[PDB]
Ligand SMILES: CC(=O)N[C@@H](CS)C(=O)N[C@H]1[C@@H](O[C@@H]2[C@H](O)[C@H](O)[C@@H](O)[C@H](O)[C@H]2O)O[C@H](CO)[C@@H](O)[C@@H]1O
């Protein structure tokens with residue numbers, strides 16, 4: 001009885017990592033860092049921020065360590081940003097710090113996707129209704145948190161696709 | 168036992184209509200029709216196309232009429248485009264034909280949202296596994312079709328929010 005919700009989640013998150021593959025395909029350093037205005041986000045920022053949001057929030061509900069630190073991606077990126085920064089609330093001067101090659105942007109997201117698939121494989125209705133304690137009143141259910149991740153990441157991955165065109 | 172999958176879908180589609188409300192606040196015709204480059208999509212196009220894709224694809228799987236025609240939104244818009252056009256495959260000159268006030272862009276999407284929630288409210292595991300395209304490889308199920316809609320619409324609504332910020 002849990003297969004239907006598991007499949008919806010697996011498919012939705014798969015669409016995200018598929019987009020990462022399209023966006024990083026042939027993605028150069030210049031194009032990845034391009035910003036149409038000094039306050040706009042770059043492709044590199046959108047890929048990094050999406051992966052961070054998914055990693056930190058999936059790891060939170062799964063009760064495990066984020067891939068970012070567990071496998072040393074934070075050190076491979078070497079960003080001049082706090083160690084657990086996700087990009088939420090960044091100012092333009094923070095956006096400019098997000099500099100990483102396409103293969104690192106893709107490798108990190110693929111590791112986040114593997115973590116995500118592992119968590120979804122054990123999804124139950126009971127887990128989807130579990131309340132998740134966060135600092136943001138109100139708490140939310142696992143289901144709402146997962147939907148929030150897909151919605152945020154799909155929006156940003158869409159923005160990155162639009163950027164590749166308008167550049 | 169269908170509640171969990173119904174809730175994932177209800178929540179995901181609700182996020183989309185919330186984005187529509189944010190995007191149409193303060194959306195003048197100059198802003199709605201703005202294209203950052205001569206060929207780029209406008210906010211109006213992104214709102215209209217997202218609603219059209221969701222309407223036509225949900226109406227198809229649900230076996231009901233699209234609200235675009237059922238309630239005469241197509242006539243209120245009065246676009247110089249075919250009656251059933253969704254914008255898929257539009258050329259730059261076709262994108263320019265999508266012009267409508269924010270109130271109509273929002274009103275149509277809200278009608279599409281209502282239709283979508285009505286279909287979700289009856290959704291079952293058996294329906295989610297029903298094959299809607301036997302010719303594709305792999306064959307397309309209702310579940311995958313719905314995920315495709317959320318993913319396309321979330322991407323485009325994200326693009327619209329990005330454009331609003333760079334205008
Ligand atoms: C889909 C989405 O927007 N999700 C949220 C939640 S995680 C988000 O990511 N906000 C960050 C994003 O804001 C962007 C900013 O507002 C632009 O003006 C707007 O045109 C974009 O559309 C919007 O993305 O980048 C900023 C740094 O440049 C950060 O300060 C923001 O926190």
Ligand SMILES: CC(=O)N[C@@H](CS)C(=O)N[C@H]1[C@@H](O[C@@H]2[C@H](O)[C@H](O)[C@@H](O)[C@H](O)[C@H]2O)O[C@H](CO)[C@@H](O)[C@@H]1O
Pocket residue numbers: 158161162163164165166206207208220254255256257258259262319322323
């Ligand atoms: C998220 C997504 O792209 N979904 C597809 C399937 S529905 C879609 O909407 N394609 C239409 C879209 O293409 C855009 C175009 O390629 C840009 O270069 C790219 O930068 C954008 O990201 C992309 O959206 O606008 C065109 C009219 O301007 C139409 O010809 C296309 O059919």
Ligand SMILES: [Zn+2]
Pocket residue numbers: 083084
């Ligand atoms: Zn720490």
Ligand SMILES: [Zn+2]
Pocket residue numbers: 049053152156
């Ligand atoms: Zn975000």
Ligand SMILES: [Zn+2]
Pocket residue numbers: 250251
């Ligand atoms: Zn017709």
Ligand SMILES: [Zn+2]
Pocket residue numbers: 216220319323
């Ligand atoms: Zn589309």
